[PDB]
Amino acid sequence: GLKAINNGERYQLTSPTAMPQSASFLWNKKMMIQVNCRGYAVAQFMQPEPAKYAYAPNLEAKTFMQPEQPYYAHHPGRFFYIKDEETGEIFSAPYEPVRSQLNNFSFNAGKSDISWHIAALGIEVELCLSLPVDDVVELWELKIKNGGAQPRKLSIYPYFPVGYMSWMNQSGDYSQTAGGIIASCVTPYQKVADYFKNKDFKDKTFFLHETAPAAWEVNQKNFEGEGGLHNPNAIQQETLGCGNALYETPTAVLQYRRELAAQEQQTFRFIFGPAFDESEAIALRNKYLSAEGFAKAKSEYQTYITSGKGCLQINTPDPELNNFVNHWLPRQVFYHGDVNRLTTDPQTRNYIQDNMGMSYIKPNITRQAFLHALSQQEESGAMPDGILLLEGAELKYINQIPHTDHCVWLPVCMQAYLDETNDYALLDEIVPYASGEKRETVEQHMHHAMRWLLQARDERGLSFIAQGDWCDPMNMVGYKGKGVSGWLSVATAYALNLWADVCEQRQQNSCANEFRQGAKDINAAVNKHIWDGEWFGRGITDDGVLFGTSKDKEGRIFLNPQSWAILGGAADEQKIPCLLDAVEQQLETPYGVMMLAPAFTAMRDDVGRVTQKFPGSAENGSVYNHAAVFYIFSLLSIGESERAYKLLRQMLPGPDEADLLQRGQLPVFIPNYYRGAYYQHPRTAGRSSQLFNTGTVSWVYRCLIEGVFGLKGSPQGLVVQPQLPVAWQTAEAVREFRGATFNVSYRKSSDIKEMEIQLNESVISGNTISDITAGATYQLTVLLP
Amino acid sequence: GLKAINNGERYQLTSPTAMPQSASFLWNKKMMIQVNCRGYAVAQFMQPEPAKYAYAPNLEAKTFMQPEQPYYAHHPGRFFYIKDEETGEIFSAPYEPVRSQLNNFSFNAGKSDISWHIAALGIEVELCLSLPVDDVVELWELKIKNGGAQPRKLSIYPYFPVGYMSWMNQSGDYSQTAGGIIASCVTPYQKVADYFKNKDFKDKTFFLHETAPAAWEVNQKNFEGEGGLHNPNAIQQETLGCGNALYETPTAVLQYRRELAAQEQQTFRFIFGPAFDESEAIALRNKYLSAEGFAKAKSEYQTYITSGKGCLQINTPDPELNNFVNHWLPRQVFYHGDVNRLTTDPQTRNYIQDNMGMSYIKPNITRQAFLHALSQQEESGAMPDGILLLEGAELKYINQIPHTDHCVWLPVCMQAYLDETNDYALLDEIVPYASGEKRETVEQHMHHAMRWLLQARDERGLSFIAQGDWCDPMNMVGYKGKGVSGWLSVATAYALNLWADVCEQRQQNSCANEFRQGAKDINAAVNKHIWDGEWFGRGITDDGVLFGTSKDKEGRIFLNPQSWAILGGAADEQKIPCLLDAVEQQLETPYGVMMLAPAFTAMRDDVGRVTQKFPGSAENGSVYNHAAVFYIFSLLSIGESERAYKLLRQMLPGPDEADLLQRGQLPVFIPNYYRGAYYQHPRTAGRSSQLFNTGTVSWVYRCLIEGVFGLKGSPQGLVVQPQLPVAWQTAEAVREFRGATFNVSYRKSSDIKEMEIQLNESVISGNTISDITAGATYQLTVLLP
Ligand SMILES: O=C(O)[C@H]1O[C@H](O)[C@H](O)[C@@H](O[C@@H]2O[C@H](CO)[C@@H](O)[C@H](O)[C@H]2O)[C@@H]1O
Ligand SMILES: O=C(O)[C@H]1O[C@H](O)[C@H](O)[C@@H](O[C@@H]2O[C@H](CO)[C@@H](O)[C@H](O)[C@H]2O)[C@@H]1O
Ligand SMILES: [Cl-]
Numbered sequence A, B: 001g002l003k004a005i006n007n008g009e010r011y012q013l014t015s016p017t018a019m020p021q022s023a024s025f026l027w028n029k030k031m032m033i034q035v036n037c038r039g040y041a042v043a044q045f046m047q048p049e050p051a052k053y054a055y056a057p058n059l060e061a062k063t064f065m066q067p068e069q070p071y072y073a074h075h076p077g078r079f080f081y082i083k084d085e086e087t088g089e090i091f092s093a094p095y096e097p098v099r100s101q102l103n104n105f106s107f108n109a110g111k112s113d114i115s116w117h118i119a120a121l122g123i124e125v126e127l128c129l130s131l132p133v134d135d136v137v138e139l140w141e142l143k144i145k146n147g148g149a150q151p152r153k154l155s156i157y158p159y160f161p162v163g164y165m166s167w168m169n170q171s172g173d174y175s176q177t178a179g180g181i182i183a184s185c186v187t188p189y190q191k192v193a194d195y196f197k198n199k200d201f202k203d204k205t206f207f208l209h210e211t212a213p214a215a216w217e218v219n220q221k222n223f224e225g226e227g228g229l230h231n232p233n234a235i236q237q238e239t240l241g242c243g244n245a246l247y248e249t250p251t252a253v254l255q256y257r258r259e260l261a262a263q264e265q266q267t268f269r270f271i272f273g274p275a276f277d278e279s280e281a282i283a284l285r286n287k288y289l290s291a292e293g294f295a296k297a298k299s300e301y302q303t304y305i306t307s308g309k310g311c312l313q314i315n316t317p318d319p320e321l322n323n324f325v326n327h328w329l330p331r332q333v334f335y336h337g338d339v340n341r342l343t344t345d346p347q348t349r350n351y352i353q354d355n356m357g358m359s360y361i362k363p364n365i366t367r368q369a370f371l372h373a374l375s376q377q378e379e380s381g382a383m384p385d386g387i388l389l390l391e392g393a394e395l396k397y398i399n400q401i402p403h404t405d406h407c408v409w410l411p412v413c414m415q416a417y418l419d420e421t422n423d424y425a426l427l428d429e430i431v432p433y434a435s436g437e438k439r440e441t442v443e444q445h446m447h448h449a450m451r452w453l454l455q456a457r458d459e460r461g462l463s464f465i466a467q468g469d470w471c472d473p474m475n476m477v478g479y480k481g482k483g484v485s486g487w488l489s490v491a492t493a494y495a496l497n498l499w500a501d502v503c504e505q506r507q508q509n510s511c512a513n514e515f516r517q518g519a520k521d522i523n524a525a526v527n528k529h530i531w532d533g534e535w536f537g538r539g540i541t542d543d544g545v546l547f548g549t550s551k552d553k554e555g556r557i558f559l560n561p562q563s564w565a566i567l568g569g570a571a572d573e574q575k576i577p578c579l580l581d582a583v584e585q586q587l588e589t590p591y592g593v594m595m596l597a598p599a600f601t602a603m604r605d606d607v608g609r610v611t612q613k614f615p616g617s618a619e620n621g622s623v624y625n626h627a628a629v630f631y632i633f634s635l636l637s638i639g640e641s642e643r644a645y646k647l648l649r650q651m652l653p654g655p656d657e658a659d660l661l662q663r664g665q666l667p668v669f670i671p672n673y674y675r676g677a678y679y680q681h682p683r684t685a686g687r688s689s690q691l692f693n694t695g696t697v698s699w700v701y702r703c704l705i706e707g708v709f710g711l712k713g714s715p716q717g718l719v720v721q722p723q724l725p726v727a728w729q730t731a732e733a734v735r736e737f738r739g740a741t742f743n744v745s746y747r748k749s750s751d752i753k754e755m756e757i758q759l760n761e762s763v764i765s766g767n768t769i770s771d772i773t774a775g776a777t778y779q780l781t782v783l784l785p
């Protein structure tokens, strides 16, 4: 079973086998953790670079998680073994590592916690994890209850495996002073400079107990013996042996022995995390490890999540949509912009898109993100591939590989900010550039970004792609310096047309003419060189070849040039229907729209690394949600209301049981992708990546707020412009906007020809609420034909 | 139980639990594999850089093995499940993953193969692995026999898990055309240059069957189900489901169903390995996968190992020593110099030392190694940190961190070559330098190496250490450009005194005077600045501090300055006894001599990264065998025969049962270390690193041949100069030397005052056999007081 519980606070899954990859996440200012329904977990923290405290049993690569992460028996996780001392029978919570038969199982994803309830052998177990707002530590609460009529003698064993910490130095021992287990290592390195760099690393891992235990074990191998995780030797014996780890793989195992009366419950608290030293671990203990500590942390954490609750609550005839939108969407949006995915060098397009989403949550964060991003613009006008969030940080990984699309996002996403807040005054703020002494207004920075995009085009008027655009791994189209991008051209035309609208609003008329003319020139160049007769191609290679065309067997059509040709005006009214049909026939699936099709099955080396990913995974033809929402947004821009809604609603798994099972995901986040290559590999199509990091969600939230519900800001006020699906006879929303609240009721009426809006029960003319007072609440009735 | 079998060809261990980390290795021209007694294995191959075909279940770091490697349930390995179709009962060979009760267990390390015999449920299993000489492929032979009186119905399932190959792209399927399973991936990368670099990678993994199976499974998760490795779901059912892997972790599982008659045995062959494509896998199949293929490969492999059998066979009163020396030592020596540890940039001191060992096996290899190494000497005379073995290869890892000791090895190790072969004519060969147009003789290159060592010294006359010397991680003594090494100074004096002896032999008298004077000058500087009163210190820091002294609490004495002060003359007859006693009191242990003591327990940042390794592991105070054999060699150089023998013999585990259990190693190789920090952590002291890669063995073989048995070359012939331990009343050796054979019998006689040598039963004067004819055999009797 699977359903929302606790008035929307949590979402419960009642089988540990039906959806075995499913998971939820928690985060805070410095860390994140993905928790799998069976007990596996992946946790990363910032110090100020990424690190972990719970390691794999081998020397693992530096990485957070892979899409479709495989788990394996010794994967890091969070476990408790229960032993009936009278029978010797054992089970583990949450389900791994023993995988015994349970009488009850619940995995509860929470807004602010993650928890389980399980039962076996007549013993009822509860486990609850939460995080504080500002420190890196996991707060663990365990409850054990004898559910039967007679007393029961139990051994209870937390099992928090630390893993293989380091080949240079790893150990662990019990510390009575810290009150628990401290594992210790030295992160490996060879360069003397890295010793200085690594000096503040939190290379201890603690597992601390509020309640003193009967015994402990710190040696992984001694814990298992020949019985393994399934039946650990240390649990077969009466008492743990109290061993340590001396250049041996350490573990965190404690033992409590209890006689529990009929119906008696006992509570045990623990904290788990990284520390520089025992002093830090003790500081965390004193701060958190108590009923009062846990309560205060939970109260402060709930307040944090409430602070990000956003601006829209809905009541539609679809209760799955309601639950997702009201309870799950806002926190996922908030995570992205509040912590910027826990990287010190966010990819520029991610920093800008994620903070766009914050316009609807905490727009002062958005405002500062534009200021910060533009401070790092290059003197040429170009934007760097990443934005540095800390002094001394560096560009890493894909950010070192030259991509060309970084400027396009600036006006695209600033439009959402200006429409929502009306903060045109941001345009006058003065910020420096990455080098040189020039300090200029936001508005002048933006002019320079758009002059950059116009200048970074070939003799045909098409945008250079270098080693990629929005498609990160599309790296061999332009690596020789001539290849051009279909998507970036049509997106540039969009960007320039938006920015020209802003310039006109600001009385910067010469700029408006210049950018509008640029947009025309690009769209003309796209129509002459990129349009392929029924859809727009993807690009042109260094050697002059157009790809993403009907002559291509794989990669015959890409979604992105279509969406963005709609947005930027390359696609006129005659072409638009060709686009819609080509996308439906070649890209649409039951799990959503694929980003390209058919998926590539072998390298094509004038397109590049994207073609070597597994067909249907990631950029190679998945239902890549972020591309799907750009299409949805484009459909909204032309009033294709039914198509927009249908494709948006496909992004949410359920309630269909086959769909839920096939995607394998809890409906508590939107993942970066559901597997594509739907025609080529139907068995795996729809499978969830399980990755909660995705710029999808800022666009999905924008689409719902401005598009579907149609409650959009303008310089005059609140524009009412809904695109509800026709099936809905009625709906409600509550919109917070510019400090006021709008209680909106929508109803279809056969008595009218044209939408009619009533404010506080009297009819308005036009579609804008213009008199908005901070703290006031307004009743809006929107009657629709 | 543990003992030699098959006339020395193999070594058998009869418990899978008593020595669970124990292992043996095999290699060939392009690959190596360590095989653990329970079924785990680590295999690396060259293409021409290192790679693997059997992966961990996560994204693992690029690495071969760690010292004291921990295994875990999903570690790569080599397994076969047996199911009794009548009862449903299952077991696995060799022992993992099921860990059932067995009725019989044998792990057989071989010179040329690795094998097991096991029995359970009345079914007798044999498993045998070998490698061909020149291709990368594992040859697997499985035998299954019904040992009972009635027919038995069995399912037989090879389980060769492929692991997590790649986050970009991984898959696998059954191929009827190749005749087995092909897993496929794309090695991850981001830089366009890496696509071109990676084009010839063998990114498929094959598991091919000679005999067609009843079914197969390629999906790891489908294989396990909820039963895991302990009780795989796919084995509980009647037939495997024949699933594939589509961006899922692939595996190699087949199923055979057989009714076996009483006493009936059947044989099944498989090959496992990497391939570029199916064509390559089929080429390997046609070449190897047959009785005739396996036989021919085994015959050619045995011939290879016989070709490296070396120059000494012994028959002493110690049958453990005999077995090790005769059957295990030579192949371990041969591996090092024949394949240079399967790196394209061997560390220079390793390339020279490993090829020194080849002087006693295939000295033409040694000769070419000197030529190759010197061709890469810098115009200054300095030697690079590594030697490149392939065009386009680069220096990697520690080879990028400046160390200063690389020249010292040249005359140190060339001495062994010249004494063994008499090939002074090598000195006249002309080779270039790394840059420039200068081509000079070996001898002139060597003069330039020694002029380099004399020039790379500070105002006190002591050798600069930069970021390390022989001790790789000793990187903070001289990183500021002033610190100096105690060890390198005293070793330089040794090197110069050896080279001066060569110059004198070659009539290069001015060079001999120059180097002998250099050696005196260094030894004087060592005695004035390094000698600490009872032993020699280790170095002096950039800020002028002498460490490795009695004022140091940790790192109070290091072994190396002592050994090499004996060799190079810094230690006179008055100091020598102080050295011997300090080493015995502070460094000697029951498992051998520690390289430093007490071990460091925290960073000391004017010494460096060595002090951060776990105390007792690796360079931080282990029984580091290679340092131990330098001491042994030094002891031999001063006729400390009993001490030399005792400490050499400690390097070989057994026959004492407690010793064997505590080290945990099969006595079929010498590991790089046995754990030290004997006073500080006795529980773990002696534990084997299990690492067969070690420059120890070329020195141990030299010590036995020239020192203990005393059969040493000179320009006149064979010098007889034994240092047998006093316990031995008699011993024999057979020495191959310069094309002749010497059958040597040693006997103690109270009837003599001085050793007496008889050649073919008549007494010689002096101690040199000078008339040596190629192909002849000589009887030597050596009578000793
Ligand atoms: O780790 C992964 O597989 C993915 O994790 C997160 O979802 C990322 O957002 C993915 O990278 C994103 O790819 C798109 C398409 O190439 C880019 O437009 C975006 O800026 C980048 O974050 C990552 O693949
Ligand atoms: O991987 C390891 O732990 C070890 O593997 C092999 O045994 C190597 O030979 C070890 O490195 C060696 O260290 C010594 C002492 O610092 C050096 O003198 C030698 O050149 C280097 O190979 C390695 O630690
Ligand atoms: Cl794209």
Ligand SMILES: [Cl-]
Residues within 6 Å of the ligand: B470, B471, B487, B558, B559, B560, B595
């Ligand atoms: Cl040393």
